Amino acid sequence: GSMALFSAQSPYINPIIPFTGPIQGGLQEGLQVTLQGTTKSFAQRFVVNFQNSFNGNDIAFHFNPRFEEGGYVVCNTKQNGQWGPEERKMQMPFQKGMPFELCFLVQRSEFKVMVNKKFFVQYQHRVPYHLVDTIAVSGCLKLSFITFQTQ
Amino acid sequence: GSMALFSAQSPYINPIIPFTGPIQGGLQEGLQVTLQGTTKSFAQRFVVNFQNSFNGNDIAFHFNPRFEEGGYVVCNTKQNGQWGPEERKMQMPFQKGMPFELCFLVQRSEFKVMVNKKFFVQYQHRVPYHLVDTIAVSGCLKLSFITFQTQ
Numbered sequence: 001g002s003m004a005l006f007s008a009q010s011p012y013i014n015p016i017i018p019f020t021g022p023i024q025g026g027l028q029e030g031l032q033v034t035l036q037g038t039t040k041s042f043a044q045r046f047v048v049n050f051q052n053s054f055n056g057n058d059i060a061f062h063f064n065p066r067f068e069e070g071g072y073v074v075c076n077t078k079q080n081g082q083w084g085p086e087e088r089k090m091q092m093p094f095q096k097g098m099p100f101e102l103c104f105l106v107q108r109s110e111f112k113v114m115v116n117k118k119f120f121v122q123y124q125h126r127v128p129y130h131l132v133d134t135i136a137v138s139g140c141l142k143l144s145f146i147t148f149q150t151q
Numbered sequence: 152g153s154m155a156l157f158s159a160q161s162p163y164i165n166p167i168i169p170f171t172g173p174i175q176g177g178l179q180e181g182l183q184v185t186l187q188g189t190t191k192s193f194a195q196r197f198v199v200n201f202q203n204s205f206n207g208n209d210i211a212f213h214f215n216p217r218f219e220e221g222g223y224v225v226c227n228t229k230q231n232g233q234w235g236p237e238e239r240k241m242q243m244p245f246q247k248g249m250p251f252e253l254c255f256l257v258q259r260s261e262f263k264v265m266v267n268k269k270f271f272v273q274y275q276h277r278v279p280y281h282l283v284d285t286i287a288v289s290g291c292l293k294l295s296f297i298t299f300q301t302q
C-alpha cells in the first residue's frame with residue numbers, strides 16, 4: 001500500500017465465526033485491523049465490535065452492515081450496556097456472496113473504515129480507544145484472516 | 152418463486168385427512184405455510200384451521216371453501232368456542248378434482264392467502280398469530296404435502 005506497514009501481533013488465520021479474540025496491548029494510534037472474508041449469500045446483517053473486555057457491555061465501535069431497507073451500515077458505541085446515538089451511512093459497500101476486505105484504521109480522533117480499499121466511513125471516538133482489548137466478529141460472514149499492522 | 156425460500160420446520164408429507172399437527176414454535180412473521188393438494192371430484196367443503204391447541208375452541212384463522220351457492224370462501228376466527236363475523240369472498244379459486252397450491256403468508260397485520268400463485272384473500276389478525284401452534288385440515292381434499300418456509 002501507500003504506507004509501510006509492520007505487524008503488531010500475529011495474524012488470526014481462518015478465524016471461525018462467531019470470533020472473539022484479543023487486541024494485544026490495546027488499540028493504538030496508527031493501528032490497522034484488516035478483515036478479509038466473504039459476505040454470506042443470503043446475508044441479513046453482520047457485526048464487528050471493538051470492545052473493552054469479553055461481556056460486550058462496553059463496545060467503543062460497533063460496525064453493523066444491514067442488508068435491509070436498501071442496504072445501510074450502522075456505527076455506534078455501547079457504554080455500561082447502553083447504546084448511544086446511531087450513525088447510519090445509507091449505502092451498502094458489501095455484496096451478498098462476495099469477498100471483501102474491511103480495514104479499520106485507528107487515528108487520534110477517529111476510526112477510518114475502508115472497504116475493498118476505498119474509504120467508506122469515519123467514526124469519531126466517543127470513548128478512549130486504548131481500553132479496547134477485544135475484537136468480536138459475528139453474523140452472516142466468513143473470514144479468511146484478521147491482520148494487525150502499524151505504521 | 153421470486154424469492155429464495157428455506158425450510159422452517161420439516162414438511163408434513165402425504166398427511167392423512169383429517170390431519171392435525173403442530174406448528175412447531177408457533178406462527179411467526181414471514182412464515183409461509185403451503186398446502187399442495189387436490190380438491191376431491193365431488194367436493195362440498197374443506198377447512199384449514201390455524202388454532203391454539205388441539206381443542207379447536209380458539210381458531211385464529213379458519214379458512215373454509217364452500218362449493219355451495221355459486222362457490223365462496225368463508226374466513227373467520229373462533230374465540231372461546233364462539234365464531235366471529237364471517238368474511239365471505241364470493242369466488243371459488245379451487246376446481247373440483249383438480250390440483251391446487253394454497254399458501255398462507257403470515258404478515259404483521261394480516262394473513263395473505265395465495266391460491267395457485269395468485270393472491271386470493273387477506274385476513275386481518277383478530278388475535279395474536281403467535282398463539283397458533285396447531286394446524287388442522289379436514290374435508291374434501293387430499294394433500295401431497297404441507298411445507299413451512301421463510302425468506
Ligand SMILES: OC[C@H]1O[C@@H](O[C@H]2[C@H](O)[C@@H](O)[C@@H](O)O[C@@H]2CO)[C@H](O)[C@@H](O)[C@H]1O
Nearest residue numbers: 047062064074075076077083084085086
Ligand atoms: O445501535 C446498534 C444496535 O442497534 C440495535 O437495533 C435497534 C435498537 O434496539 C433500537 O434503538 C431501535 O430503535 O432500532 C435499532 C436498530 O438500529 C441492534 O439490535 C443491535 O444489535 C445493534 O446493532
Ligand SMILES: OC[C@H]1O[C@@H](O[C@H]2[C@H](O)[C@@H](O)[C@@H](O)O[C@@H]2CO)[C@H](O)[C@@H](O)[C@H]1O
Nearest residue numbers: 198213215225226227228234235236237
Ligand atoms: O363462521 C365459520 C363457521 O360457519 C358455520 O356456519 C355458520 C354459517 O356460515 C352462517 O351463515 C351462520 O348463520 O351460522 C353458522 C354458525 O354455525 C359452520 O358450521 C362452521 O363449520 C364454520 O365454517
